[PDB]
GROMACS .gro file of C-alpha atoms in nm:
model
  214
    1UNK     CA    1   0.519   1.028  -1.781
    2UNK     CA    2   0.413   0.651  -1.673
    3UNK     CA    3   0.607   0.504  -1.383
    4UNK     CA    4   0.863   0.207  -1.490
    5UNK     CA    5   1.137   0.280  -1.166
    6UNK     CA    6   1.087   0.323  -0.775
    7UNK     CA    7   1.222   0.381  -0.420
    8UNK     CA    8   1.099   0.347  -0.117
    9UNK     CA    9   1.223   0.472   0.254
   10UNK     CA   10   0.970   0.322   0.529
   11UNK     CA   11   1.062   0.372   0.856
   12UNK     CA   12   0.897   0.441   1.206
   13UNK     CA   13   0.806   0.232   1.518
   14UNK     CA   14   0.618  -0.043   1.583
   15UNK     CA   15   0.489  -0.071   1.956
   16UNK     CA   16   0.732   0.177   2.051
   17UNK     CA   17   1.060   0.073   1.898
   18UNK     CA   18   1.207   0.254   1.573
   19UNK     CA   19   1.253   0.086   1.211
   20UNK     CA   20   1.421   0.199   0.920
   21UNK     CA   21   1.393   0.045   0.544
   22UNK     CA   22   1.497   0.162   0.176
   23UNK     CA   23   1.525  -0.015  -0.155
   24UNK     CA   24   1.417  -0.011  -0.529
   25UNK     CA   25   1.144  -0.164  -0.722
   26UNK     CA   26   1.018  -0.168  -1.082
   27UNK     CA   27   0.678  -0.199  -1.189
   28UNK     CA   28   0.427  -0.213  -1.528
   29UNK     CA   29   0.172   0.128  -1.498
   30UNK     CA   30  -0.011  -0.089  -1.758
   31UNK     CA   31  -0.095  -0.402  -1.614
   32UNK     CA   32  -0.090  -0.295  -1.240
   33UNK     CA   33   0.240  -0.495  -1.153
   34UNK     CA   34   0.465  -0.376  -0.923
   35UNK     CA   35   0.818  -0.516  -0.746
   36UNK     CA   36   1.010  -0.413  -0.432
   37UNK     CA   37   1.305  -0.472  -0.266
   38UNK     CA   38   1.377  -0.349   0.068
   39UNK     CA   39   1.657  -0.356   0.319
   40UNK     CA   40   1.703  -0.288   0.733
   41UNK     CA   41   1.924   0.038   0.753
   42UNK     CA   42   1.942  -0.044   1.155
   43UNK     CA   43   1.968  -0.411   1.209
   44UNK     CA   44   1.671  -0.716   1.276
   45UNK     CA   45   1.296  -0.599   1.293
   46UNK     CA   46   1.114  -0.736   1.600
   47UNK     CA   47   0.796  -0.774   1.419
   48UNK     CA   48   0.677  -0.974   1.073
   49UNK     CA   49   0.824  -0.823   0.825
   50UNK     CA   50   0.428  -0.907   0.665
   51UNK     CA   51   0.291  -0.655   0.900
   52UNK     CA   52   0.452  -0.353   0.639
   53UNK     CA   53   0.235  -0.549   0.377
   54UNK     CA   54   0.033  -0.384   0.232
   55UNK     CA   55   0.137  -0.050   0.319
   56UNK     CA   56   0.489  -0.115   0.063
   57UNK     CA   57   0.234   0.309  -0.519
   58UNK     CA   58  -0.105   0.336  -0.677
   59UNK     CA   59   0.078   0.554  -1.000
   60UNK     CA   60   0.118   0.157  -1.101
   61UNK     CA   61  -0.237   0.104  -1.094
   62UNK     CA   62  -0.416   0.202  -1.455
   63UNK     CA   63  -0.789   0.215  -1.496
   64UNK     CA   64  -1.019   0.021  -1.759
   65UNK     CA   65  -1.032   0.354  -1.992
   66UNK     CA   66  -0.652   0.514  -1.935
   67UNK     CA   67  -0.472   0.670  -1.632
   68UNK     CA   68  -0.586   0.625  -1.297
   69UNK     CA   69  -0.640   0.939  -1.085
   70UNK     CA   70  -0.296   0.878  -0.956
   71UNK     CA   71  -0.131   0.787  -1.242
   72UNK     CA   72  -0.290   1.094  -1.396
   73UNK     CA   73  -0.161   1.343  -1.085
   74UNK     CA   74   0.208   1.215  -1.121
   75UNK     CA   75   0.194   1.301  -1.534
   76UNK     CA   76   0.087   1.590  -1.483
   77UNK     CA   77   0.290   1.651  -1.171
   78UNK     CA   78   0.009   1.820  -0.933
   79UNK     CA   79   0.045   1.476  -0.775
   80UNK     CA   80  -0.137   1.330  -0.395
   81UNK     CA   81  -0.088   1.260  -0.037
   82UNK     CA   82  -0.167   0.970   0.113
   83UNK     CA   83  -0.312   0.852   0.509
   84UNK     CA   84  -0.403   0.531   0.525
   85UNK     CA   85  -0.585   0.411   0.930
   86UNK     CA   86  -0.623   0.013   0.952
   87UNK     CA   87  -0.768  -0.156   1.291
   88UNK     CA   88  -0.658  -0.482   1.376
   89UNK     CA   89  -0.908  -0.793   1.563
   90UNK     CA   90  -0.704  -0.802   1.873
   91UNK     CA   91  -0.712  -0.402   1.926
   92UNK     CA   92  -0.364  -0.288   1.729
   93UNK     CA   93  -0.380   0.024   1.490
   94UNK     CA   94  -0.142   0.119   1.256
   95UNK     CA   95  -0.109   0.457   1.070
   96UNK     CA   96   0.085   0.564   0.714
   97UNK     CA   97   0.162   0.889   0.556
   98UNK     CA   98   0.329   0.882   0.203
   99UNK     CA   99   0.492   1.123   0.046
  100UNK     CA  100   0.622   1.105  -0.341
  101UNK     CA  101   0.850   1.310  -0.571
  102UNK     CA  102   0.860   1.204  -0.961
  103UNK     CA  103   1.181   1.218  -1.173
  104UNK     CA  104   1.042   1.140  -1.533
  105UNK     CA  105   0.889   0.784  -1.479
  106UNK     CA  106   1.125   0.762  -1.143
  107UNK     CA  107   0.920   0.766  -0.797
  108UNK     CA  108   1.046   0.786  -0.460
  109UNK     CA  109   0.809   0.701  -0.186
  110UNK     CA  110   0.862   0.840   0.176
  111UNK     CA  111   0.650   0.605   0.436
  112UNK     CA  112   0.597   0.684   0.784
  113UNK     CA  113   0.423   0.418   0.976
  114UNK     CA  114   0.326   0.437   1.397
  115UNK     CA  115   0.226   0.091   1.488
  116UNK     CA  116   0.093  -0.023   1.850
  117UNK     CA  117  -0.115  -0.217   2.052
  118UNK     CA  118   0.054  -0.564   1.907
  119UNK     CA  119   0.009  -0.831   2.233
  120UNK     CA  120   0.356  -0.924   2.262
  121UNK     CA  121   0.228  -1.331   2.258
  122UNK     CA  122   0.045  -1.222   1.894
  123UNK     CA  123   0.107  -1.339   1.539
  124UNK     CA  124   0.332  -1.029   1.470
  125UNK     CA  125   0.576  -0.995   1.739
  126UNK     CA  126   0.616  -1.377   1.753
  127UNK     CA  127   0.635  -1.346   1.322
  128UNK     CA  128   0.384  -1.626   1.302
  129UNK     CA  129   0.235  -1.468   0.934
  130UNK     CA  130   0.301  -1.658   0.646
  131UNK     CA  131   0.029  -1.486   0.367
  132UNK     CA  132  -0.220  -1.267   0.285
  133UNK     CA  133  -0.557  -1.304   0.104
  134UNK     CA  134  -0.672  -1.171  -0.137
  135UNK     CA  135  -0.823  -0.841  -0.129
  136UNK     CA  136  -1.115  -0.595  -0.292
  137UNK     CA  137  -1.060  -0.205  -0.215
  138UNK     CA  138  -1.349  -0.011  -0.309
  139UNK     CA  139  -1.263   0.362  -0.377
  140UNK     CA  140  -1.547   0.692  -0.373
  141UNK     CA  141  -1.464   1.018  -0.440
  142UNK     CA  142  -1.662   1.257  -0.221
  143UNK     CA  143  -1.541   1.536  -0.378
  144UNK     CA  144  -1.258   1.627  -0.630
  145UNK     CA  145  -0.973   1.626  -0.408
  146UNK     CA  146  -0.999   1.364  -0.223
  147UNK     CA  147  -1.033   1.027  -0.272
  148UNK     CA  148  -1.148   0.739  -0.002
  149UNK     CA  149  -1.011   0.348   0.000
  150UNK     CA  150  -1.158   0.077   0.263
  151UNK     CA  151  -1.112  -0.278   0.270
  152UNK     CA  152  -1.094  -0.603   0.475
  153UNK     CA  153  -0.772  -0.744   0.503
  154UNK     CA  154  -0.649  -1.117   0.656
  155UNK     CA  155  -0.344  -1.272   0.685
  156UNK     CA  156  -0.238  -1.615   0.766
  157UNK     CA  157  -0.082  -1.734   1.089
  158UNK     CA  158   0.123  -2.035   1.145
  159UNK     CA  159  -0.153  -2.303   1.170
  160UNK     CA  160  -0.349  -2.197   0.884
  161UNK     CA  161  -0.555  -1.949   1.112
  162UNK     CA  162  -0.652  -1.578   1.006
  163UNK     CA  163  -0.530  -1.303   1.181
  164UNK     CA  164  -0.768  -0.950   1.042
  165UNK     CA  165  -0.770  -0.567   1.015
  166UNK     CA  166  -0.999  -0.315   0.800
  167UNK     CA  167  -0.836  -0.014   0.656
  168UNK     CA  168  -0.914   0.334   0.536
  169UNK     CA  169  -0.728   0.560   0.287
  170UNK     CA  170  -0.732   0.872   0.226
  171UNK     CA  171  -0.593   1.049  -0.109
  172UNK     CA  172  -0.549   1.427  -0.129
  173UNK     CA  173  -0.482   1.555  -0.496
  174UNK     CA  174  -0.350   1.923  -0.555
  175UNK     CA  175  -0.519   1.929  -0.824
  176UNK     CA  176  -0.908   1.839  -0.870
  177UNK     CA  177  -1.006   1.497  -1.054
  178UNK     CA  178  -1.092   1.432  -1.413
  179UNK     CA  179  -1.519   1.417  -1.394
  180UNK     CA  180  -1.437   1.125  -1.575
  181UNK     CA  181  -1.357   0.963  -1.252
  182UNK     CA  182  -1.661   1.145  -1.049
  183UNK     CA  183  -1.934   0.923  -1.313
  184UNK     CA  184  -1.799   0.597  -1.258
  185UNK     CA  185  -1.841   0.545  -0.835
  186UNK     CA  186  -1.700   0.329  -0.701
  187UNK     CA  187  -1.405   0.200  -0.818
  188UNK     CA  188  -1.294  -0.165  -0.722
  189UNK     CA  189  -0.947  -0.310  -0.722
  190UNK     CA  190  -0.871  -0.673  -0.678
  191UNK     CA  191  -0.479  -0.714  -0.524
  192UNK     CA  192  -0.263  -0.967  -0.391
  193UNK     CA  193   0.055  -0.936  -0.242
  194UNK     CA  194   0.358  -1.211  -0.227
  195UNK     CA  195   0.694  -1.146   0.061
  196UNK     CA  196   0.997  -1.326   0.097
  197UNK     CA  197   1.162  -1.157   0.412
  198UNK     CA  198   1.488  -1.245   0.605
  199UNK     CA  199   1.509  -1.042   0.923
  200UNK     CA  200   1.679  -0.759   0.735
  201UNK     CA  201   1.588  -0.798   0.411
  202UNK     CA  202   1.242  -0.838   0.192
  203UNK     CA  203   1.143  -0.863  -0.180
  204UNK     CA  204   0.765  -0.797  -0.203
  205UNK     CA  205   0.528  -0.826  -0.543
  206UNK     CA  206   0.183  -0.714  -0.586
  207UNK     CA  207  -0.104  -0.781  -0.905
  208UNK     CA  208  -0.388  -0.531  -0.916
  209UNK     CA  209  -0.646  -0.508  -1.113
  210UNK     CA  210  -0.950  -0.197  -1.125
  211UNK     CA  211  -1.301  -0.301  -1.240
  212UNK     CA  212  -1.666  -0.164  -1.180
  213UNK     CA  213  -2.032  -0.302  -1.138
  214UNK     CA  214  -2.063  -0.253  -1.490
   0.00000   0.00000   0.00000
């Protein structure tokens, strides 16, 4: 059935040195809303703690006429996979691979992220990110499987500068799509995401919200 509780363990490297976080979260699979909390389980990150935003669970997420695709594959329990591929303005990538397993309307998340290319005088090895805009995903479905996610992304520095990346995701369902989903291409989301983060320690919210051109 419909999420309500979550976990998370996100852990990896990021320009060559290891990370490690877990934590809970709640969210509403009705309105899109989700909450996390996540702590260190080795000691201080050397990098913003916003650079792991967004990548910190689309079963949250409904659609204007029921279940998302996601939401749908975890009630069911065929479930998805998820790679996600963002490019950042000053030549830094960053990969993600999720994994989920679903305990009545209890999700735990497996993230593994590999981060490099950061210049060690940018905005997130010196932690100078403070926000992030706003931000419209639009999601196709090129076959029944799979589904595909871009979007621009921005944070905010320091001195009110932007600091940018575009992004690609990549859904793989076990079992094929509802050709409910197939007649209405694409899908938009609208999102934004708030962090407060010690060095160890982060509690992160997002609002989403699926429309069409309709």
């Amino acid at each position: 059935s419909l999420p309500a509780t979550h976990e998370l363990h996100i852990f990896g490297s990021i320009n060559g040195v290891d990370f490690d976080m877990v934590g809970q979260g709640t969210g509403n699979p009705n309105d899109g809303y989700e909450e996390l909390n996540l702590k260190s389980t080795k000691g201080d990150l050397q990098f913003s703690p916003w650079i792991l935003v967004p990548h910190i669970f689309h079963q949250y997420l409904p659609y204007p006429d029921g279940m998302s695709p996601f939401q749908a594959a975890m009630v069911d329990g065929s479930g998805y996979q998820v790679h996600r591929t963002m490019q950042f303005e000053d030549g830094a990538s960053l990969t993600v691979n999720y994994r989920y397993t679903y305990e009545g309307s209890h999700i735990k998340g497996e993230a593994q992220v590999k981060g490099t290319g950061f210049p060690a005088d940018g905005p997130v090895m010196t932690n100078s990110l403070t926000a992030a805009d706003w931000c419209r995903s639009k999601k196709t479905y090129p076959n029944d499987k799979t589904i595909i996610s871009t979007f621009k992304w921005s944070y905010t520095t320091g001195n009110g500068k932007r600091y940018r990346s575009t992004a690609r995701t990549t859904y793989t369902f076990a079992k094929p799509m509802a050709a409910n989903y197939l007649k209405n291409q694409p899908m938009y989301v609208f999102r934004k995401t708030e962090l407060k983060h010690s060095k160890t320690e982060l509690n992160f919210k997002e609002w989403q919200k699926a429309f069409t051109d309709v």
